[PDB]
Amino acid sequence: VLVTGATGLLGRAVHKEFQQNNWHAVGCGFRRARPKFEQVNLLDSNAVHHIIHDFQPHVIVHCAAERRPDVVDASGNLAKEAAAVGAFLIYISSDYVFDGTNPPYREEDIPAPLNLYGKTKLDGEKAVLENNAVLRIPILYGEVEKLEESAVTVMFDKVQFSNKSANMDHWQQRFPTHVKDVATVCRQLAEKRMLDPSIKGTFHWSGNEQMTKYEMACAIADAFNLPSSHLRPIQRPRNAQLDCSKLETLGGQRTPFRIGIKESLWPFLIDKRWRQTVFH
Amino acid sequence: EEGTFLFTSESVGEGHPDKICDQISDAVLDAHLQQDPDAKVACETVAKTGMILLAGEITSRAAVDYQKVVREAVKHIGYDDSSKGFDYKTCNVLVALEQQSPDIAQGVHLDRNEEDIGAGDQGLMFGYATDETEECMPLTIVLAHKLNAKLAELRRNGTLPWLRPDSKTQVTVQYMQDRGAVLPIRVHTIVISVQHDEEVCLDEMRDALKEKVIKAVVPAKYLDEDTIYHLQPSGRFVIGGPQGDAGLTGRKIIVDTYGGWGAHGGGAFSGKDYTKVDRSAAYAARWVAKSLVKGGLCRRVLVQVSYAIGVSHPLSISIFHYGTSQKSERELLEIVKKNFDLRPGVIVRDLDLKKPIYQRTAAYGHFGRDSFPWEVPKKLKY
Amino acid sequence: EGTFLFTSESVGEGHPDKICDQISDAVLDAHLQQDPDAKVACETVAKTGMILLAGEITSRAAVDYQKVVREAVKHIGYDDSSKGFDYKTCNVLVALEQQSPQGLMFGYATDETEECMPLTIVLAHKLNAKLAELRRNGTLPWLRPDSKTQVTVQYMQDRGAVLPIRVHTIVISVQHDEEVCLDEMRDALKEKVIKAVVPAKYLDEDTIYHLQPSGRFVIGGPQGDAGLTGRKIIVDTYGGWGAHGGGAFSGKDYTKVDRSAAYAARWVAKSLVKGGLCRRVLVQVSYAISHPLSISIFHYGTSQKSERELLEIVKKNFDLRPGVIVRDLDLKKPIYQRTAAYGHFGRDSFPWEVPKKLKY
Amino acid sequence: LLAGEITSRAAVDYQKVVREAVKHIGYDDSSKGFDYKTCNVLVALEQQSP
Ligand SMILES: C[S@@+](CC[C@H](N)C(=O)[O-])C[C@H]1O[C@@H](n2cnc3c(N)ncnc32)[C@H](O)[C@@H]1O
Ligand SMILES: [Mg+2]
């Protein structure tokens, strides 16, 4: 039960989800991993080697961490030694692989992205797949420690401050997905594969709510009973919806956005932030 | 850097003279309670070279041998020989105890129903709670206490028979702010000084402290290679406790509570019965704070209450949740009003404050400890 | 509203613990006035007819402990047995051990009063002072030295700062003679003490008054309640506001960092507020086993500048090495006895209470 | 405990006098009932100096 990027929004969700429900879970990350997670750098080869060859993991989850641009990696190392011990790797990936024209993009569809973050995700999939899962996901939100941990949560300030108006992108259709919903999906693709092989090949998950930046902003405002009138609608895929078929075909989890984003963003309410000092 | 900050809390052993006094004071409270549950007790204690002085006011149907009680407590602490700087067998015990003032008695508890008895004093009191540990206490103060507790346990066990009772522990932790909550990262520094016999070499003690004390108490997660260890700094400490020093009841109020976190209203616990709200309301306030954290209404909370003498009800109640709750601070206040009744006449029953086990509270903190009634969270109905 | 209440208390000079603090610092003074480098840890204990002095002293001075003690008790007002205590006839016991030849500390300041102190404690302090003044006046001749006050203020949250709105509740208990009646006393405390100390704007018809709530306070001073040095540390400081690490002030000399660095930390905190750099602030100082290892500044979001920026501003205006602190604050001079009542902070007379103009 | 009235110019260390006398007498350990090293020494002498 090893989780990478366990200090990130996604990884903290994964580790939580396993450990509470009948697993001995152990996460890791480069930046500031201790005290809650055994510290490990991915690009340090002997470090990666030690903990895997020392822990005896049933399953591994490589989480691609941090968001916000919206404008490198060799993950092959992992698969070599992931499979070396009796366990299978789940490489998390992004909808920034398809062009965003013929939705809903299928598991077996052919990818065609553009520039930074586009194909740079495929090279990791190549490296993982060759030498022996690839669970793609859309834009993520969740219970963030800082607003910049999610491309959804950064907007919250702009939603609150009416005094200055801002413009939100209505161009790009997306499916904001609670990392916690992904956390369970990941627990389900592991809970079963150990019993029912041979579950691998490229996979797709996503929530069922279609939204744009502007609609997400107004969804957030209306969740907190706030004024949204100051919001203004106006190389990336137009709509790369993820055809969530295979894992849905088996039999996932879905948290309604208006409840999940409210649960996640209440601690960043202006009034609460003022109150968040060490001493009264 | 990130929102990182250092914070230190300290604790002391039973041999520290301030805590010797606290312990004695509570030993006299326990002695009185055993025969008179309604004993009025305000017993201050003073320790000095060769001397224990009891001073204060007690009204009790109990009959108590102050000599025995004082000397027996000094025995339990472990000062039994001139070589240790103090001996219960041969020390000076002086007693300056009078009756509680009638003017207070009439104005507080005379001819009144238990529920209507006024606070025994004016005062202000705080309760604090924090999800950074299972005990809902600051890690800094929890480690500080436990370290001293480990030392005396090992002393009594015979595993370290070169230890004496006086000890002081400081614990510094590197903390991260988290949306009003606080997160401990690592133990920055541990300082340990403890009294010892003349026979042992410095390097055996420092070895024992690290391997046999610190590692038994502090989780490996919090320790690392940059963690600074000052064990027995400046050598010496062969003599300790009251000898060449002076100590009093009520001079470790911060050590007794939250190691610098939360807040404090000045009032000292030891030597006082439940009608002294410095203690009873403070225990109550902690019970409230913890109940809110364990009940999931917040991650961190500070509670204030105040009282006037001869008045049953709190003059004021205040809740600060450090923006760690979805509910407003006024919502929490409202929840507190309908689940708690903080008159000393009612708290005594809720927390059972006539039992003679106050001497157990006189060291290693009054809060965050198993089997204390104020540590058992009340389920809230809202 | 988004309002809240907060309470702080104070005590008079005749309160037994505060007696003990005053003597402890009168002792200190008497030593320093003879010996600038005298080391002092003087505990004072008070109970019916007894002042016990205890602790450790390294000094070249020879002090008449009996004159020191009796003069303090005279000053405080305990000059007859009918008042429970008399400097003329009391017992002075000395157990001091003379010879001849690491820690958090907190400063706090708030712009809610001119004195940069929480309004709660400021009013509580001042209430006790009007009592002593009026007792010595002979305006209220039935007054006696032992007293306690408590102020609860209703506050507003305002962007990290705290905004006093009104005085919600006031408690005054004061020792009195056997002549005066209860109604007269209560009528006097409200009209002559409270209305002379609390600004009118904060007093309304819903303000609750617990005046002589005990009903009788004739027995008092050490007779009423044992007193000890160092048992009013929150009254000495911030009245539940800010923070406190645990050390008593009174009876220690400047070489005790519990005192001298605490005074400095306030000095800094009060400089920042009076420099308009922050509406309110708490200053932390970890000293290590030299300059202070770590310093945190919590400006409560009430400063346009960052914490690092405020730190730098602190570094180039303040020397916080114990040695330098005593020079800057003139701590070798023997007038600590004036600190031991009415709180150590919030009075212009003290070096640490005079804000240093900041150049940054 | 030392009690009584003294009028004099000397500055006596009552610590040393009391402790050194008790040492001479031979009370130096708790097993013996009394010890010059650890005993309380209380002074209520009322002294002046004309
Ligand atoms: C309530 S008293 C006594 C504390 C404890 N309850 C006892 O019996 O000793 C503590 C402080 O309150 C004040 N006080 C003493 N007697 C009082 C009385 N009869 N009425 C009101 N206040 C009093 C004095 O300032 C005293 O130091
Ligand atoms: Mg104490």
Numbering used by the authors:
A (entry chain F): 20 to 90, 103 to 163, 167 to 268, 277 to 293, 295 to 323
B (entry chain B): 14 to 395
C (entry chain A): 15 to 115, 135 to 322, 325 to 395
D (entry chain C): 66 to 115
Give excerpts from the publication.
S-Adenosylmethionine (SAMe) is the principal methyl donor of the cell and is synthesized via an ATP-driven process by methionine adenosyltransferase (MAT) enzymes. In humans, there are three genes, mat1A, mat2A and mat2B, which encode MAT enzymes. mat2A and mat2B transcribe MATα2 and MATβ enzyme subunits, respectively, with catalytic and regulatory roles. The MATα2β complex is expressed in nearly all tissues and is thought to be essential in providing the necessary SAMe flux for methylation of DNA and various proteins including histones. Here we report the crystallographic and solution X-ray scattering structures as well as biophysical analysis of the MATα2β complexes, providing the basis for fresh insight into this widely utilized system in biology.
The crystallographic structure of the MAT(α2)4(βV2)2 complex reveals that MATβV2 interacts with MATα2 through the insertion of the C-terminal tail of the β subunit into a cavity created at the interface of the MATα2 dimer. The complex has four active sites located at the interface of the MATα2 dimers. The structures show that two of the four active sites are occupied by SAMe or adenosine whereas the other two are empty, thus providing details of structural differences that accompany SAMe formation by comparison of empty and occupied sites. In all of the structures the adenine group makes a π–π stacking interaction with F250 of MATα2, supporting the hypothesis that the substrate (ATP) and product (SAMe) can occupy the active site in similar orientations. In addition, the N-terminal loop (residues 1–13) of both MATβV2 in the complex, which is orientated to the same side of the open active sites, is disordered. This observation raises the question of whether the N-terminus of MATβ could regulate the gating loop of MATα2. In our case, co-crystallization and soaking experiments with an excess of NADP yielded crystals of the MAT(α2)4(βV2)2 complex without NADP. The structure of the MAT(α2)4(βV2)2 complex presented here has direct implications for a broad range of SAMe-based biochemistry.
